[PDB]
Amino acid sequence: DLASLAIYSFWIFLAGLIYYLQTENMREGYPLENEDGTPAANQGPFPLPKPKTFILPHGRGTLTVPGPESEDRPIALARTAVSEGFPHAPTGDPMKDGVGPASWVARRDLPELDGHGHNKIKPMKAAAGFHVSAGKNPIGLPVRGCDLEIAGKVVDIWVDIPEQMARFLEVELKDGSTRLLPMQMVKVQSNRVHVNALSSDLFAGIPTIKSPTEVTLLEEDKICGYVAGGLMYAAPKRKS
Amino acid sequence: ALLSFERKYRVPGGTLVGGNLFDFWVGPFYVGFFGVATFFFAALGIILIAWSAVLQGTWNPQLISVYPPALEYGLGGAPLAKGGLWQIITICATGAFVSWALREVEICRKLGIGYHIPFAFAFAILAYLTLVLFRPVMMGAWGYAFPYGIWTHLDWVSNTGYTYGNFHYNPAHMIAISFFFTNALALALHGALVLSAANPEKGKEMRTPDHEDTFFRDLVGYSIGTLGIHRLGLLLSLSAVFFSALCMIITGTIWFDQWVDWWQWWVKLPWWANIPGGING
Amino acid sequence: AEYQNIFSQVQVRGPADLGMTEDVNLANRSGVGPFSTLLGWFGNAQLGPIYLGSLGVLSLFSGLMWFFTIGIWFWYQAGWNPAVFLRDLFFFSLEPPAPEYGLSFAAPLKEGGLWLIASFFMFVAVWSWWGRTYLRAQALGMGKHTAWAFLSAIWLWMVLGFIRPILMGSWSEAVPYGIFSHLDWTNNFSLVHGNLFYNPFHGLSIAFLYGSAHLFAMHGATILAVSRFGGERELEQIADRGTAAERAALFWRWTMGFNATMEGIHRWAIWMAVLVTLTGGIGILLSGTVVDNWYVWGQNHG
Numbered sequence: 001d002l003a004s005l006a007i008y009s010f011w012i013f014l015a016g017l018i019y020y021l022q023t024e025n026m027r028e029g030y031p032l033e034n035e036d037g038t039p040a041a042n043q044g045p046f047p048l049p050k051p052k053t054f055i056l057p058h059g060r061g062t063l064t065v066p067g068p069e070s071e072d073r074p075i076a077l078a079r080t081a082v083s084e085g086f087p088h089a090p091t092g093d094p095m096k097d098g099v100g101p102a103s104w105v106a107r108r109d110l111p112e113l114d115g116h117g118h119n120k121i122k123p124m125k126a127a128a129g130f131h132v133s134a135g136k137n138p139i140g141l142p143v144r145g146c147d148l149e150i151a152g153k154v155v156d157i158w159v160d161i162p163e164q165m166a167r168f169l170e171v172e173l174k175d176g177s178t179r180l181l182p183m184q185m186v187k188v189q190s191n192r193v194h195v196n197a198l199s200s201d202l203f204a205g206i207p208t209i210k211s212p213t214e215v216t217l218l219e220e221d222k223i224c225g226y227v228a229g230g231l232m233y234a235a236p237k238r239k240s
Numbered sequence: 241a242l243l244s245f246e247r248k249y250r251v252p253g254g255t256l257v258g259g260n261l262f263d264f265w266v267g268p269f270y271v272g273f274f275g276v277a278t279f280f281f282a283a284l285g286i287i288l289i290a291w292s293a294v295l296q297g298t299w300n301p302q303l304i305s306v307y308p309p310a311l312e313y314g315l316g317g318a319p320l321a322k323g324g325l326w327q328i329i330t331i332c333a334t335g336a337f338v339s340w341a342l343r344e345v346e347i348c349r350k351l352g353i354g355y356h357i358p359f360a361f362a363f364a365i366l367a368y369l370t371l372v373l374f375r376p377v378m379m380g381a382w383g384y385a386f387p388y389g390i391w392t393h394l395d396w397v398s399n400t401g402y403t404y405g406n407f408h409y410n411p412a413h414m415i416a417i418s419f420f421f422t423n424a425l426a427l428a429l430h431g432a433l434v435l436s437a438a439n440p441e442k443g444k445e446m447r448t449p450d451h452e453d454t455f456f457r458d459l460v461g462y463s464i465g466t467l468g469i470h471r472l473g474l475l476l477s478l479s480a481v482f483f484s485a486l487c488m489i490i491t492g493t494i495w496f497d498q499w500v501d502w503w504q505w506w507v508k509l510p511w512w513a514n515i516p517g518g519i520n521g
Numbered sequence: 522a523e524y525q526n527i528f529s530q531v532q533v534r535g536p537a538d539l540g541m542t543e544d545v546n547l548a549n550r551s552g553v554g555p556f557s558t559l560l561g562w563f564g565n566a567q568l569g570p571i572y573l574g575s576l577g578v579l580s581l582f583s584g585l586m587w588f589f590t591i592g593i594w595f596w597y598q599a600g601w602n603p604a605v606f607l608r609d610l611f612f613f614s615l616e617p618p619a620p621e622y623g624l625s626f627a628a629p630l631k632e633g634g635l636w637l638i639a640s641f642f643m644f645v646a647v648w649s650w651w652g653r654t655y656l657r658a659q660a661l662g663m664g665k666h667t668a669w670a671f672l673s674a675i676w677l678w679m680v681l682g683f684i685r686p687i688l689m690g691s692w693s694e695a696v697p698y699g700i701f702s703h704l705d706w707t708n709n710f711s712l713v714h715g716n717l718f719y720n721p722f723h724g725l726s727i728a729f730l731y732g733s734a735h736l737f738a739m740h741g742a743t744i745l746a747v748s749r750f751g752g753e754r755e756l757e758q759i760a761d762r763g764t765a766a767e768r769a770a771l772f773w774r775w776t777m778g779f780n781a782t783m784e785g786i787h788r789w790a791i792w793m794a795v796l797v798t799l800t801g802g803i804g805i806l807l808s809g810t811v812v813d814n815w816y817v818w819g820q821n822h823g
């Protein structure tokens with residue numbers, strides 16, 4: 001009868017849908033690899049999809065996926081064991097080497113652009129006429145790390161123009177240069193900005209930006225990477 | 241086997257218990273202390289369910305069912321075949337869930353992300369505990385809880401509902417349902433927006449958040465934003481579940497008559513209660 | 522305690538953002554509305570601009586025609602008395618015609634005809650509005666996903682108030698406009714059809730609805746947990762995957778063994794949601810037309 005027919009059909013449909021959805025979600029990170037970078041033997045029952053090509057605006061090119069995957073960077077880790085599946089220890093200082101929770105990806109070394117071709121993210125001082133509109137204005141507050149030492153002072157806010165929201169705090173350090181701190185890893189208080197993820201001596205270590213009125217995708221990854229990693233790797237100096 | 245980008249993240253760290261002892265993967269799955277816990281609880285519970293499916297006498301998934309202690313048993317224990325299994329399976333399931341949540345925390349820690357996921361999961365778990373622990377306990381018996389069967393838990397839903405008339409008139413239920421419905425609409429919209437931007441008309445370039453904001457302003461005079469829509473999905477969905485659990489914690493406890501009658505508080509308000517005309521006078 | 526990014530700590534405003542232009546007729550956009558600081562704790566503060574146009578006006582109007590048509594009946598039911606009106610607000614109901622009249626338009630205003638009128642204005646208002654969602658996309662050079670997804674909500678709505686009443690032979694089979702009276706209709710519907718819990722499409726509808734809440738919690742939380750690496754900037758993580766996308770993917774792969782991409786997750790999402798009302802609509806269309814009783818049907822697993 002019709003109802004039996006409609007449901008049986010639907011299950012067939014749904015089966016196909018899952019297939020299509022699962023394959024679509026295999027456009028990044030596949031094929032699976034062994035711990036050494038070789039293609040693993042068991043890829044499971046789902047094949048890769050025929051690739052698709054995104055046209056990026058502003059002449060930034062195209063991305064076509066699935067495509068050949070590589071990290072395009074040195075990875076400072078080594079095996080802790082003789083078989084698959086254990087952790088990989090950091091060969092050096094994992095914060096500086098960009099591994100573990102301090103990891104960054106080698107994204108494009110240009111800044112994200114808005115719909116008009118302009119830099120998406122600017123320090124507020126060069127963003128006209130942006131201003132703090134509500135909540136405590138952090139500019140000028142001393143910055144404190146998880147060791148409860150002052151590591152610097154807030155000197156601007158980097159803001160996302162098209163979305164009109166705050167994205168980093170620019171902070172000046174003892175030596176006069178600045179660093180970006182992601183907005184989401186700082187707690188603005190009445191008389192200070194607090195940063196749990198980093199002890200004060202680890203601020204200098206924050207990756208820097210090559211031009212001081214813009215930040216590239218690559219640089220954002222290095223920074224956000226570094227600051228997050230601080231939760232694990234500056235647990236000796238926190239203190240809370 | 242690893243995703244192409246996975247190795248750099250597979251470092252030691254972030255466990256809450258057991259230090260390095262269970263810090264490793266099995267395939268793609270992280271283990272950890274709470275991965276062992278989870279296994280243990282889930283294994284037990286499934287074993288016991290497969291037992292119950294013998295002490296009741298079937299191996300059909302559409303029939304297997306594990307019922308709580310009958311109401312006479314109160315809050316005390318009950319022989320395995322008469323709802324002790326259920327009792328233990330309910331402990332096992334709670335063990336497995338809470339373990340799953342704490343394991344999620346461990347993964348968060350190793351990945352240096354926020355804890356927002358397992359915090360959210362916690363709201364489904366509190367819903368479950370309302371139905372099988374907090375409601376039953378406050379009502380005085382395991383018997384008020386729902387049973388573990390596919391089609392039988394549906395019957396429980398129906399009986400429990402109709403016990404209070406048409407359950408639609410539970411006000412918290414109305415609010416919960418508003419959230420569920422809205423959530424589904426928000427999920428649909430979000431999904432379609434992100435994709436109409438990432439997959440524009442043939443030959444055009446990817447659109448931008450600016451197009452996304454723009455499209456909603458054109459359409460309805462407001463765009464919530466890319467941060468906001470994820471804020472919203474999470475609030476809609478958690479609130480649907482919060483008001484779900486609320487709607488039932490109060491049913492059979494602070495309110496136990498017919499839900500439709502509860503509305504008479506509004507109608508009998510003195511300033512209009514006896515004005516003639518309308519549906520009510 | 523850490524900062525969780527549920528609300529903002531600091532809002533910034535710059536100049537009124539009038540939007541992208543592409544192929545949009547700028548003549549038809551309004552100018553900005555106010556800025557809500559309140560809203561800006563959670564999302565955008567900027568209200569507007571909005572876009573009117575002929576379809577705009579048509580829908581807006583037609584929807585108020587629908588709305589007031591119902592409100593006029595409601596006042597009338599309240600004997601034109603403010604106090605009653607508010608007291609009994611949830612009880613009033615603009616009911617469809619009796620079954621005598623079948624699909625005819627003959628029924629008197631007071632006993633059915635007025636329901637067809639409001640129904641008419643609703644039909645117009647919704648479908649015009651659907652045309653709006655397609656066109657605002659087209660003007661911006663964007664995909665049609667929003668209009669296709671909205672189509673799935675329309676499906677269930679058409680089924681309920683139009684397609685099914687036609688197939689069944691009467692407008693009386695349709696749903697009334699009224700807060701409590703539509704819930705009664707809903708309960709009632711289940712009873713007369715043998716409990717909807719036995720309609721396999723009702724069960725699927727539920728799975729997707731719960732699925733939707735489940736998924737969006739996952740996703741919403743995930744994007745929030747990786748918002749510290751820029752995660753909400755989804756379109757740009759699609760085109761150039763960042764550690765935000767990686768950390769999200771891996772969280773799920775470690776937790777439950779598989780995972781998604783920053784695009785693909787939105788395909789899971791659009792479908793989880795559209796399938797609620799898709800299955801939903803079928804289940805109802807089949808009820809009464811082909812299945813008088815879901816329990817019975819169920820005993821024949823078919």
Ligand code: 2GO
Nearest residue numbers: 421424425428584585588646647650670671674794795798
């Ligand atoms: C895929 C399934 C999912 C389900 C969960 C779903 C459910 C629902 C429900 C429900 C849970 O019952 C409702 C109530 C619902 C409603 C909607 N869905 Zn809906 N919906 C879904 C999915 C979708 C999708 C993708 C879309 C909608 C879109 C829409 C749209 C359809 C808009 C429409 O039809 O407009 C025409 C009539 C109007 C605007 C006037 C109505 C009268 C009003 C009450 C009067 C007060 C307000 C005036 C406008 C103020 C004017 C003042 C004057 C002085 C100028 C609305 C928000 C529509 C949209 O525009 O989104 C905001 C759209 O694109 N929906 N939707």
Ligand code: 2GO
Nearest residue numbers: 286368386390391393397723724725727728729731732735
């Ligand atoms: C929430 C209100 C009430 C409670 C008592 C309830 C609880 C539960 C629980 C619980 C608290 O543990 C579970 C696990 C559960 C599961 C179900 N219910 Zn359920 N359920 C309720 C009410 C309903 C209603 C009205 C309906 C379901 C229907 C269903 C259906 C569809 C559920 C769904 O899709 O929810 C969204 C979540 C998704 C998509 C994540 C994936 C979930 C996956 C399908 C779980 C399958 C569970 C196994 C069958 C249980 C075996 C455990 C162990 C032996 C491995 C399944 C069997 C569904 C159905 O068609 O069932 C025959 C349906 O129509 N449920 N249901």
Ligand code: 2GO
Nearest residue numbers: 282285332333336340360361363364389390731734735738
């Ligand atoms: C809070 C908002 C929302 C609600 C609406 C929601 C609903 C649901 C329902 C529902 C609508 O019924 C179901 C069924 C559901 C299921 C899930 N959600 Zn879910 N879910 C939500 C939100 C979330 C969030 C943030 C998360 C989950 C996560 C998960 C995960 C949790 C998996 C898990 O915890 O595993 C540990 C335990 C295991 C593997 C086995 C336990 C066996 C047990 C001992 C024996 C079985 C006992 C049951 C009570 C049998 C009843 C069956 C009967 C009702 C048919 C599953 C897929 C979980 C996850 O990993 O997802 C893949 C996760 O992180 N969920 N989820």
Ligand code: 2GO
Nearest residue numbers: 674675678707708710711718723726727730801802804805
């Ligand atoms: C006594 C009631 C009975 C019981 C058995 C029952 C229980 C349950 C439970 C439970 C036991 O807990 C759940 C969880 C449940 C769930 C469902 N049931 Zn259900 N269910 C029942 C009965 C019914 C009935 C009659 C129906 C459903 C239907 C459904 C479906 C409905 C899914 C849904 O999202 O529906 C809402 C969306 C609609 C109707 C689309 C409307 C879109 C339209 C275009 C918008 C128009 C907007 C206006 C112009 C207003 C403008 C506003 C302005 C401010 C802009 C859901 C999954 C729904 C369905 O799809 O059925 C298969 C439906 O028609 N249900 N149901």
Ligand SMILES: COC(C)(C)C/C=C/C(C)=C/C=C/C(C)=C/C=C/C(C)=C/C=C\C=C(C)\C=C\C=C(/C)CC/C=C(\C)CCC=C(C)C
Nearest residue numbers: 588591592640641644678679681682683696698699700703
């Ligand atoms: C304060 O007072 C004033 C006067 C200012 C305004 C107040 C108004 C009030 C209080 C209005 C209240 C309105 C309410 C409560 C509305 C509730 C509506 C509900 C719950 C609707 C639910 C479902 C509706 C459905 C399913 C409708 C489906 C409709 C269709 C599918 C359209 C079908 C079209 C038909 C039958 C017309 C056929 C004719 C042609 C030409 C196609």
Ligand SMILES: CCCCCCCCCCCC[N+](C)(C)[O-]
Nearest residue numbers: 289300301304305306388389390
């Ligand atoms: C306590 C609930 C009983 C669960 C039974 C085992 C679940 C396996 C999945 C059900 C599959 C049903 N199927 C396809 C055989 O009909």
Ligand SMILES: CCCCCCCCCCCC[N+](C)(C)[O-]
Nearest residue numbers: 414415416417418419422426472
């Ligand atoms: C899109 C935002 C809409 C938010 C409203 C969600 C539906 C809830 C309706 C009941 C109102 C109860 N509430 C939230 C005020 O407590």
Ligand SMILES: CCCCCCCCCCCC[N+](C)(C)[O-]
Nearest residue numbers: 721722723724725728732792793
């Ligand atoms: C987008 C795919 C996600 C999968 C969620 C759906 C799970 C299926 C639930 C079984 C419902 C069974 N029934 C009786 C309604 O037919």
Ligand SMILES: [Fe+3]
Nearest residue numbers: 430434744755
């Ligand atoms: Fe998203």
